[PDB]
């Protein structure tokens, strides 16, 4: 057996609102960005945060010392950072190329030596990574285990990704400088934080703990074409091109490092291939009653799309009414990897919780369509 | 339950390149040869190596996703498809990009059925603790099989035109030596192309040889160790990394900012301590090991210069392993990274050198910032 008997989340500086966002981000050529309104009229979010600062935009935090700040919020007088077997870490936005980011996040915590994985990927790269976590305490090898992710997405949000290209633009003669939406998109979208969870072979005496039934995972990769990006282009067949088969002209002439997403692919296909062909099979092979779920936590991005994968649970037989959601996203932000975290964060922090009562945990990532699924029962 | 290797696969990338070639095929920094790559290949002694590049066209001939489902592929056989596979773990340390993960762009090259991919990052290590992941997929019950794999394609990033913009930078500057750092030449005639992939099931295979997996022991010493080995990023005076992103965009460019580079004098004095001999005293101790039990020795070393280095190492550990029970193909195959150790395995594996009940011990030394795996097997 696995339990999560211990979870934080650590959210850089202050909130920001809507109205302030666009200054600590930056405008693009001068002028503020013409999407930024109707993106955040229709992903409903309303704060968020970024590890920036907000007098001299200088950064906060690295991704490596957000991890690392959300393992020290799991230290109480039952854990210390030196009573753990193996971290398993993961960030979608990692300082570097290499190394990966977990022993970057054991350099910053200087915890004494033990095992440390990194895991990478986008939205669902902190499931993997508690994935690993949970079969490392439920087949033995350790009896305790923990998990942890970062986001640090402005990083690369920031207009200073975009300079380059603004001016190959301007350069080129264009009569629209500004980027491309496929670029500014998920500047008004994902936001910065961090969190991890502590996972042991017996649940916590006080409190509650959260039992790990399973985590299953799914990528429809096989068929489905590459949605998210960035360190490489979406050719016209559909295929990503690599950001080393580019010239370095073309590096910043392109923002090939910025985040990208193709929205058409998006909206059309993120549903059924990150929400009901994954959940089908496993309401099938696990034969699951959506009347069993006391607690529904969705990681979905966006507003836009909460109704949306609602009548995918309909379509499928599995309906949860809205008053079993829970969801911190519009306060929070979407924090990509990190969501689900903060989300348990605050859930098992609020007292709802009662013993019996059954989760079911939905990371859907759109990068190229994998959808992750936690079932948990509060002991 | 117990977890078994029945199948391993490598797959190599075009036809091996001598000593003499390779820097025609990596390419020149601003039209002259490199001083160092005589006295690099001397200690390193490496003989051969693969590129994914075109030897006629220079053209890349596969993607680092392309490489791994080529290792992948070369598992199916009458026991095994490719829509048998339960959970695939893959990773590179040269990644095609940042997002996705390598391993959703692995499984959209096999085109398989959906299953559950995972993806692991880091260097030489990487291919590790995706093995790992497979490992305890299995131990625990989760699945019945598990695919790891690793793929490394440095020459996407070794060749010549990824400092072209430093050496228009510096000649704009009017530098004394336009040449690049040590630091970014030294690995470029290190680090070559490969790929290695594993099956690995509850059950042993019927006929023919299997590796039970007895433990993997993973540790990392970067909570007091300086990072060694990077890339997206340069090291500072204090010994701490500087990401990429809070780089301008004219320094990504004029100072090769996403090219590999090692910090060779804090390699050379603390990879032997910080990648076996800490790691492996803590393990010899916790399993009560006796160095006479190991038949067979992989150590994935990287350099013929450290080959003796860690054999002292073991010596000093009182953890002797005699150099004719030592299996490695480096000098042939090349410093092909967190593939190493695949490569390595796949040729003894289908050597027919190894006998049933044998114990073999594998060692995966990781410089990027100090890891050392650990892997026992037991033939079957």
Redesign the interface.
């Known amino acids: 057996n696995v339990y999560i008997t211990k979870v934080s989340a650590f959210m850089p500086g202050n909130p920001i609102d809507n109205n302030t966002m666009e200054s600590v981000l930056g405008f693009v050529g001068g002028r503020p960005s013409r999407s930024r309104h109707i993106v955040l009229r229709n992903n409903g979010i309303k704060y968020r945060h970024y590890a920036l600062d907000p007098e001299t935009g200088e950064?906060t935090y690295?991704?490596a010392q957000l991890a690392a700040e959300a393992v020290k919020g799991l230290v109480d007088e039952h854990f210390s950072l030196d009573d753990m077997q193996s971290?398993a870490a993961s960030s979608?936005?990692?300082?570097?190329?290499?190394?990966?980011?977990?022993?970057?996040v054991?350099?910053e915590?200087?915890?004494?030596?033990?095992?440390?994985?990194?895991?990478?990927?986008?939205c669902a790269?902190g499931m993997?990574a508690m994935?690993?976590a949970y079969?490392?305490v439920?087949?033995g090898?350790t009896s305790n285990a923990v998990s942890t992710t970062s986001e640090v997405p402005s990083?690369?949000l920031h207009a200073?990704?975009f300079?380059?290209e603004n001016e190959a633009r301007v350069a080129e003669l264009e009569r629209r400088p500004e980027i491309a939406f496929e670029k500014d998109f998920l500047r008004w979208m994902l936001s910065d934080g961090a969190g991890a969870a502590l996972l042991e072979n017996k649940p916590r005496p006080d409190g509650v703990s959260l039992r790990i039934d399973?985590i299953?995972?799914?990528?429809?990769?096989?068929?489905?074409e590459?949605c998210?990006?960035?360190?490489?282009e979406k050719l016209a067949d559909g295929s990503?091109k690599?950001?080393?088969?580019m010239?370095?002209?073309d590096?910043?002439a392109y923002s090939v490092?910025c985040?990208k997403q193709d929205v058409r692919y998006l909206n059309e296909r993120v549903v059924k291939f990150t929400l009901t062909?994954?959940l089908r099979?496993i309401v099938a092979d696990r034969n699951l009653s959506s009347e069993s779920i006391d607690w529904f936590l969705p990681a979905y991005s966006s507003e836009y799309f909460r109704m949306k994968f609602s009548e995918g649970l309909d379509d499928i037989n599995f309906s949860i009414e809205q008053e079993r959601w829970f969801t911190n996203l519009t306060v929070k932000g979407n924090t990509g990897s990190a969501s689900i975290y903060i989300m348990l964060d605050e859930l098992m922090k609020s007292g709802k919780l009662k013993k019996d009562q059954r989760l079911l945990c939905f990371i859907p990532e759109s990068?190229?369509f994998?959808g992750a699924f936690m079932h948990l029962t509060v002991v």
């Open positions: 950064a690295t991704s971290l979608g936005t990692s300082d570097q190329i290499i190394p990966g980011h977990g022993v970057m054991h350099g915590l200087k915890n004494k030596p033990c095992e440390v994985i990194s895991t990478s990927g986008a790269a993997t994935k690993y079969l490392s439920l087949s090898a990083t690369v200073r990704n300079q380059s399973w299953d995972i799914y990528s429809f990769a096989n068929e489905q590459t998210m990006y960035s360190g490489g990503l690599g950001w080393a088969q010239s370095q002209a590096w910043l490092f985040i062909e994954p099979r990068a190229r994998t």
